[model samples]
Target: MQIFVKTLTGKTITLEVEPSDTIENVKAKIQDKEGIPPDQQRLIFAGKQLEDGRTLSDYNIQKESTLHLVLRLRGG
Candidate 1:
């Protein structure tokens, strides 16, 4: 399956990942592609966190679906 990933920097990356790919796996892939750390990652779908270890199917994401990854900013 193909998933569309979008970064907070307005960068979009597409990946051909297995259907069994979990949110954690996707986070790793996004980290590899965007150079962002997973711990610093915050993926929100339907206005909620993409809980770790949960597959896309578990989240109701189908093939060729798009997921957005927004970076969290800490206050000074």
Candidate 2:
């Protein structure tokens, strides 16, 4: 399945995913594609926060669904 990651800048990151893909899995992909670390990522879907170890299917994420990517880039 394919899912989308929307950033704060209103930009979208398109990603190809698997049915058993976990939130962490998605983050790894995000890290690979967008260079965003998982530690800096918080994925939100359907008005709910998505946690690690939870598969996208657990959230009823359908193909083409846009998951919001909240980034925390607080660096000193």
Candidate 3:
């Protein structure tokens, strides 16, 4: 399936993933593409935070879906 991904850095990346891929896989892919740490990435879908090990089906993600990969910001 093809999915549109938007990163916190305002970059857009499209990926073809299998249904077997979990949220962690997405995170790792983003890290590989954006050079960011997996822990620093947050996957959001349908306005809900996605946790690791959660599959696309677990989150009701469909084929040709779009997900937002927001960078976990930390500052004080």
Poorly placed runs, candidate 3 (over 4 Å): 73-76
Candidate whose lDDT is highest: 2
At residue 41, what lDDT does model 1 achieve?
79
lDDT of 1 at 58: 74
TM-score of each: 0.79, 0.90, 0.82
The superposed Cα distance between candidate 3 and the true structure at residue 58, in angstroms, equals 0.5
C-alpha lDDT values of all predictions? 0.77, 0.90, 0.80
lDDT of 3 by residue, 1-76 (tens): 8887877668789877877898888778777877888888788988998888888777778877888888776453
Per-residue lDDT tens digits for candidate 1, residues 50-76, read 888887767767777777788776353
lDDT of 2 by residue, 8-50 (tens): 8899999999869988999999999988899899899888998
Model 2: lDDT equals 0.90
Best by TM-score: 2
